[PDB]
Amino acid sequence: AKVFQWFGSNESGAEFGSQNLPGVEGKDYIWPDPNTIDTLISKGMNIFRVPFMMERLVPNSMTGSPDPNYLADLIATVNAITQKGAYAVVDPHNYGRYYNSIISSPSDFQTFWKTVASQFASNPLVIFDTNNEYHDMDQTLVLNLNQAAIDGIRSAGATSQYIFVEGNSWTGAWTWTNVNDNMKSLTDPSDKIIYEMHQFLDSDGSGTSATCVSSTIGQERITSATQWLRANGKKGIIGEFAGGANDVCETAITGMLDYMAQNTDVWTGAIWWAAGPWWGDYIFSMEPDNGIAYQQILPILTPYL
Numbered sequence: 001a002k003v004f005q006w007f008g009s010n011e012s013g014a015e016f017g018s019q020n021l022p023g024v025e026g027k028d029y030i031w032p033d034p035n036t037i038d039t040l041i042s043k044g045m046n047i048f049r050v051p052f053m054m055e056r057l058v059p060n061s062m063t064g065s066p067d068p069n070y071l072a073d074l075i076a077t078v079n080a081i082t083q084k085g086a087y088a089v090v091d092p093h094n095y096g097r098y099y100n101s102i103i104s105s106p107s108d109f110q111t112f113w114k115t116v117a118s119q120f121a122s123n124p125l126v127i128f129d130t131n132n133e134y135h136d137m138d139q140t141l142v143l144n145l146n147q148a149a150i151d152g153i154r155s156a157g158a159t160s161q162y163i164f165v166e167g168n169s170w171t172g173a174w175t176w177t178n179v180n181d182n183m184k185s186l187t188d189p190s191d192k193i194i195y196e197m198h199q200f201l202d203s204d205g206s207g208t209s210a211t212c213v214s215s216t217i218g219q220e221r222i223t224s225a226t227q228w229l230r231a232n233g234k235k236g237i238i239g240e241f242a243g244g245a246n247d248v249c250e251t252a253i254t255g256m257l258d259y260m261a262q263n264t265d266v267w268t269g270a271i272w273w274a275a276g277p278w279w280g281d282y283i284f285s286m287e288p289d290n291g292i293a294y295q296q297i298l299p300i301l302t303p304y305l
Contacts, residue, residue: 002044002046002304002305003261003264003303003304003305004260004261004264004267004268004269004270004304005264005268005269006046006047006087006237006268006269006270006271007044007045007046007047007269007270007271007301007304007305008040008045008046008047008048008049008086008087008269008271008272009040009045009047009048009049009271009272009273009274009275009286010048010049010050010051010239010240010271010272010273010274010275010276010286011032011037011048011049011050011051011077011274011275011276012032012051012273012274012275012276012278012279013029013030013031013032013051013276013277013278014029014030014031014032014050014051014052014053014056014070014073014074014077015029015051015052015053015093016028016029016030016278017029018053021053021055021056021059021099022055022056022059022067022070023056025069025070025073029053029056030276030277030278031073031074031076031077032048032050032077032080032275032276032277033277034077034080034081036275036277036287036288036289037080037081037086037275038084039288039289040275040286040288041084041086043298043302043305044302044305045086045305046085046086046087047086047087047088047089047127047269047271048081048086048087048088048089049089049091049129049239049240049271050074050077050078050081050088050089050090050091051091051093051132052070052074052090052091052092052093053092053093053094054092054094054098054112055098055099056070057070057071057074057092057116058112058115058116061108062098062103062108062109062111062112063108063111063112063115065115066115066119071119074090074119075119078090078120078123078126081125082123082125082126085125086125087125087126087127087162088125088126088127089126089127089128089129089164089239089271090116090120090126090127090128090129091129091132092112092116092129092130092131092132093131093132094131094132095131095132095133095134095135096131096133096134096135096137096141096142096145102137102138102141103131103145104141106141106144106145106147106148107148109145109148109149109152110148110149110151110152110155111152112152113128113130113148113149113151113152113153113156114152114153114155114156116128116153117152117153117154117155117156117157117158117161118156118157118158120158120161121156121157121158123161124160124161126158126161127161127162127163127164127194128149128153128158128161128162128163128164129163129164129166129196129239130145130146130149130150130163130164130165130166131145131149131166132166132171133166133170133171133198134166134167134168134170134171135168135169135170137168139168139179139180139182140182142167142168142180142183143182143183143185143186146165146166146183146186147186147187149163149165150163150165150186150187150188150193154188154189154190159189159190160190161190161192162192162193162194163188163190163192163193163194164194164195164196164237164239165183165186165193165194165195165196166196166197166239167179167180167183167195167197168180170198170205171196171197171198171239172197172198172199172205173197173198173199173221173222173225173238174199174205174221174222174224174225175205176197176224176225176228177224177225177227177228181228183195184232184234193234193235194235194236194237194268195229195234195235195236195237196236196237196238196239197222197225197236197237197238197239198238198239198240198241198273199218199221199222199238199240199241199256200240200241200242200243200273201213201217201218201221201241201242201243201249201252201253201256205221207240207242207273207284209244210243210244210245210246210249210283210284211244211246211248211249212243212244212246212248212249212252213252214248214252215248215251215252215255216251216252216255217252218241218243218252218253218255218256218257218259219252219255219256219258219259221256222238222256222259222260223259226259226260226263226266226267229266229267230263230265230266234266235266235267235268236266236267236268237267237268237269237270237271238260238267238269238270238271239271240271240272240273240274241253241256241270241271241272241273242272242273242274242284242293243284243297244283244284245283245292245293245295245296245297250296250297250300253297253300253301254300257270257301257304261304270304272284272286272293272297272301274286275287275288275291275294279291286298
């Protein structure tokens with residue numbers, strides 16, 4: 001019996017080596033492995049978030065044509081997930097920036113999103129994620145970019161799919177009410193907006209240390225976001241979270257997920273950061289069969305699957 005609408009993992013790799021554009025597949029970046037996705041599906045996960053770079057999918061200008069090879073691999077990855085019945089989140093992992101400059105044109109972003117959504121418009125198990133972790137940019141612009149993405153997606157006939165919107169401050173849950181209130185005004189004719197927040201458990205919330213602040217830091221960092229979602233009649237998802245393979249972090253993870261489980265009127269679930277084939281000894285690797293989080297964290301997550 002699953003606790004949440006969605007529970008699963010990021011499948012990182014296609015966004016690796018971001019300093020090399022276009023970069024070379026198999027050298028700078030790699031796409032997820034469908035066989036290990038299948039293992040995670042067998043463990044009960046039902047959502048896989050797939051980062052990719054906007055510049056690799058649609059080079060030079062975001063209003064242009066896709067790159068055939070990178071698009072073909074995005075398609076193959078999405079279909080490998082959705083053919084099994086799980087959800088695939090299409091994540092342009094771009095921080096609100098394109099060639100390292102803030103995306104200041106909502107109309108250009110809308111065209112990019114019509115291009116992408118057109119490739120997936122018939123697939124109800126695709127979820128479109130407007131952009132990973134907007135940060136250090138104008139707050140009204142972030143609202144307008146999310147709205148332009150929705151408008152482009154729905155304009156392509158992709159009307160069955162959920163859209164994950166992301167806020168400023170690296171879409172952090174703990175910082176949400178301090179900066180992202182204006183995000184409440186987003187509109188969607190399909191009524192399928194989910195507010196995607198990210199939450200890490202180290203001191204600065206960057207998700208770079210295996211050490212968690214305390215055994216309660218996760219549940220603490222999502223309380224005001226939970227109240228904001230409820231007050232505004234919205235639904236949310238934790239689209240990235242992690243903690244180290246240690247007792248304090250394991251307790252923080254369980255406490256945060258147990259809190260979300262008693263607040264499913266607003267929380268639709270959670271997605272671990274991260275699996276993928278090029279993580280090696282990464283402190284948060286969910287990649288079967290030998291990632292540290294796969295071995296040591298997944299056993300504490302099975303109660304939610």
